[PDB]
Design an enzyme around this catalytic site. Structure first.
Site, PDB file in Angstrom:
ATOM      1  N   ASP A 180       0.862  -1.182   0.000  1.00  0.00           N
ATOM      2  CA  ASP A 180       0.000   0.000   0.000  1.00  0.00           C
ATOM      3  C   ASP A 180       0.907   1.243   0.000  1.00  0.00           C
ATOM      4  O   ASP A 180       2.120   1.135   0.178  1.00  0.00           O
ATOM      5  CB  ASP A 180      -0.924  -0.040   1.222  1.00  0.00           C
ATOM      6  CG  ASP A 180      -1.991   1.083   1.225  1.00  0.00           C
ATOM      7  OD1 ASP A 180      -2.311   1.674   0.167  1.00  0.00           O
ATOM      8  OD2 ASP A 180      -2.512   1.363   2.312  1.00  0.00           O
ATOM      9  N   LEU A 181       0.327   2.412  -0.223  1.00  0.00           N
ATOM     10  CA  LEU A 181       1.070   3.660  -0.270  1.00  0.00           C
ATOM     11  C   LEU A 181       0.918   4.508   0.996  1.00  0.00           C
ATOM     12  O   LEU A 181       1.858   4.617   1.793  1.00  0.00           O
ATOM     13  CB  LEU A 181       0.665   4.447  -1.526  1.00  0.00           C
ATOM     14  CG  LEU A 181       0.961   3.749  -2.862  1.00  0.00           C
ATOM     15  CD1 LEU A 181       0.541   4.652  -4.058  1.00  0.00           C
ATOM     16  CD2 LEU A 181       2.438   3.317  -2.969  1.00  0.00           C
ATOM     17  N   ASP A 182      -0.257   5.119   1.187  1.00  0.00           N
ATOM     18  CA  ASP A 182      -0.519   5.938   2.388  1.00  0.00           C
ATOM     19  C   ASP A 182      -0.309   5.103   3.663  1.00  0.00           C
ATOM     20  O   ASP A 182      -0.867   4.005   3.804  1.00  0.00           O
ATOM     21  CB  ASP A 182      -1.967   6.466   2.403  1.00  0.00           C
ATOM     22  CG  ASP A 182      -2.317   7.364   1.208  1.00  0.00           C
ATOM     23  OD1 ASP A 182      -1.463   8.112   0.663  1.00  0.00           O
ATOM     24  OD2 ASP A 182      -3.519   7.370   0.861  1.00  0.00           O
TER      25      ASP A 182
ATOM     26  N   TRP B 276      -2.136  10.627   4.213  1.00  0.00           N
ATOM     27  CA  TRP B 276      -3.051  10.382   3.083  1.00  0.00           C
ATOM     28  C   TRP B 276      -2.789  11.408   1.974  1.00  0.00           C
ATOM     29  O   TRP B 276      -3.004  12.605   2.167  1.00  0.00           O
ATOM     30  CB  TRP B 276      -4.519  10.522   3.518  1.00  0.00           C
ATOM     31  CG  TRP B 276      -5.133   9.345   4.237  1.00  0.00           C
ATOM     32  CD1 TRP B 276      -4.845   8.021   4.072  1.00  0.00           C
ATOM     33  CD2 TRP B 276      -6.218   9.401   5.168  1.00  0.00           C
ATOM     34  NE1 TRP B 276      -5.662   7.251   4.878  1.00  0.00           N
ATOM     35  CE2 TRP B 276      -6.517   8.081   5.552  1.00  0.00           C
ATOM     36  CE3 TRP B 276      -6.963  10.449   5.713  1.00  0.00           C
ATOM     37  CZ2 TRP B 276      -7.543   7.779   6.467  1.00  0.00           C
ATOM     38  CZ3 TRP B 276      -7.968  10.150   6.628  1.00  0.00           C
ATOM     39  CH2 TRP B 276      -8.241   8.830   6.993  1.00  0.00           C
TER      40      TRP B 276
ATOM     41  N   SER C 215      -3.232   0.774  -3.975  1.00  0.00           N
ATOM     42  CA  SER C 215      -3.728   1.895  -3.170  1.00  0.00           C
ATOM     43  C   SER C 215      -5.141   2.310  -3.582  1.00  0.00           C
ATOM     44  O   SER C 215      -5.440   2.387  -4.757  1.00  0.00           O
ATOM     45  CB  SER C 215      -2.810   3.104  -3.346  1.00  0.00           C
ATOM     46  OG  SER C 215      -3.329   4.254  -2.701  1.00  0.00           O
ATOM     47  N   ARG C 216      -5.998   2.585  -2.602  1.00  0.00           N
ATOM     48  CA  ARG C 216      -7.349   3.088  -2.863  1.00  0.00           C
ATOM     49  C   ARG C 216      -7.447   4.618  -2.889  1.00  0.00           C
ATOM     50  O   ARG C 216      -8.562   5.170  -2.917  1.00  0.00           O
ATOM     51  CB  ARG C 216      -8.354   2.497  -1.847  1.00  0.00           C
ATOM     52  CG  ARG C 216      -8.152   2.939  -0.388  1.00  0.00           C
ATOM     53  CD  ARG C 216      -9.382   2.551   0.507  1.00  0.00           C
ATOM     54  NE  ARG C 216     -10.153   1.445  -0.074  1.00  0.00           N
ATOM     55  CZ  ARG C 216     -10.094   0.162   0.286  1.00  0.00           C
ATOM     56  NH1 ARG C 216      -9.331  -0.267   1.297  1.00  0.00           N
ATOM     57  NH2 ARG C 216     -10.844  -0.709  -0.367  1.00  0.00           N
TER      58      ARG C 216
ATOM     59  N   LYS D  73      -9.685  -3.775  -2.470  1.00  0.00           N
ATOM     60  CA  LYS D  73      -8.360  -4.383  -2.575  1.00  0.00           C
ATOM     61  C   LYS D  73      -8.414  -5.779  -3.200  1.00  0.00           C
ATOM     62  O   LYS D  73      -7.415  -6.257  -3.752  1.00  0.00           O
ATOM     63  CB  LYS D  73      -7.674  -4.448  -1.196  1.00  0.00           C
ATOM     64  CG  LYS D  73      -7.321  -3.074  -0.647  1.00  0.00           C
ATOM     65  CD  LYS D  73      -5.867  -2.648  -0.867  1.00  0.00           C
ATOM     66  CE  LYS D  73      -5.713  -1.167  -0.495  1.00  0.00           C
ATOM     67  NZ  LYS D  73      -4.488  -0.850   0.307  1.00  0.00           N
TER      68      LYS D  73
ATOM     69  N   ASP E  20      -0.971  -0.921   6.404  1.00  0.00           N
ATOM     70  CA  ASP E  20      -1.203  -0.335   7.716  1.00  0.00           C
ATOM     71  C   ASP E  20      -2.599  -0.644   8.258  1.00  0.00           C
ATOM     72  O   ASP E  20      -2.802  -0.572   9.463  1.00  0.00           O
ATOM     73  CB  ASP E  20      -1.014   1.194   7.608  1.00  0.00           C
ATOM     74  CG  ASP E  20      -1.551   1.957   8.795  1.00  0.00           C
ATOM     75  OD1 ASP E  20      -0.867   1.996   9.838  1.00  0.00           O
ATOM     76  OD2 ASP E  20      -2.638   2.557   8.656  1.00  0.00           O
TER      77      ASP E  20
END
Length: 170
Positions: free
Chosen positions: A20-22, A29, A78-79, A109, A132
């Site tokens: 994931d990114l954030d 975010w 990532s969403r 996801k 996370d």
């Protein structure tokens, strides 16, 4: 024997590491806490359009270099709604080379993972995933992916623990 050591070492590793990114690669975010677009300043610091600093968690570059040294390719899932901004940060932090395959858009996801499997051909059982959000860990584990819950950003200890968890899970 040398060949046994080599092949056994190869077999213990995931064939894809998904991030994931954030709150995994960076402590915010991207669609909320900063104001895109971004740029790298003359001092080497990435900043947003209001001059706020943007950075990775400190051990993220070493984590990704370690995966590269092990031969484990990477993917992003990532969403975020800030797709352009997310992709600009990947560029400015020099991470596009590692994250060849990317699913960056609002959605399930489970949809991200379906599309990553299509793009890579890798069975879910041979993937590792760092995120996370516990709810994502719960959901993606149902596909057979080894899912490692992040607390306080990606780091070297989480990578080590994750790899050992994956190796034991076979």
């Amino acid at each position: 024997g040398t060949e046994n050591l080599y092949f056994q070492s190869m077999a213990r590793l995931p064939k894809l590491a998904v991030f994931d990114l954030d709150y995994t690669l960076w402590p915010f975010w991207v669609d909320t806490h900063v104001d895109p677009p971004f740029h790298k300043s003359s001092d080497g610091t990435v900043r947003d359009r209001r001059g706020q600093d943007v950075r990775l968690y400190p051990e993220v570059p070493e984590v990704l270099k370690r995966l590269q040294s092990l031969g484990v390719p990477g993917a992003a899932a990532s969403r975020t709604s800030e797709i352009e901004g997310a992709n600009q940060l990947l560029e400015l932090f020099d991470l596009f080379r590692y994250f060849v395959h990317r699913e960056i858009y609002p959605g399930s996801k489970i949809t991200h993972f379906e599309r990553l499997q299509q793009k890579t051909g890798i069975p879910f059982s041979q993937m590792i995933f760092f995120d996370d959000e516990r709810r994502n860990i719960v959901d993606v584990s149902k596909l057979g992916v080894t899912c490692i819950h992040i607390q306080n950003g990606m780091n070297l200890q989480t990578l080590s623990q994750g790899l050992e968890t994956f190796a034991k899970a076979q």
